[PDB]
Design a protein around this ligand. Sequence first.
Ligand SMILES: COc1ccc2c(c1)C(c1ccc(Cl)cc1)=N[C@@H](CC(=O)NCCCNC(=O)OC(C)(C)C)c1nnc(C)n1-2
Length: 127
Amino acid sequence: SMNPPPPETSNPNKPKRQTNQLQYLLRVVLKTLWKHQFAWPFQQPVDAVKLNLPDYYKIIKTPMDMGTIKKRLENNYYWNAQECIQDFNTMFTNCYIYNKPGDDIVLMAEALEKLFLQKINELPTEE
Ligand SMILES: COc1ccc2c(c1)C(c1ccc(Cl)cc1)=N[C@@H](CC(=O)NCCCNC(=O)OC(C)(C)C)c1nnc(C)n1-2
């Protein structure tokens, strides 16, 4: 078990926007989660080699992480906010799929997801 290529963060063929909702996802949502004490496991793709998780990419076929989301937002990769919200939800779900209830990493994901939900509850109406 090598690592897979990371998710795409650059693709000139993909149409792009910078909507007020996407600006909120960067300035409020990503920034709030990134600074949290429990962000670090999520700030880059899972390194299955260094973590000795040879089954990780056997189980997880839609990897996602906040490093990827941060690059997507900074590079204006998205067309809409729903695409970015889906990336956050994929990241949390992958953690819950791979790990066991009550594991430390699951507790970390749950704490970040609570904050994520609190912030996207106030996603502004698209202008
Ligand atoms: C860069 O470091 C990363 C990156 C990603 C991680 C993890 C670590 C971390 C991470 C884990 C604990 C804490 Cl406190 C924080 C993180 N979790 C991985 C999944 C994983 O490694 N599972 C091994 C399970 C083996 N059990 C284990 O060793 O338990 C002991 C025996 C009590 C020590 C895992 N699953 N999803 C993610 C994200 N991650």
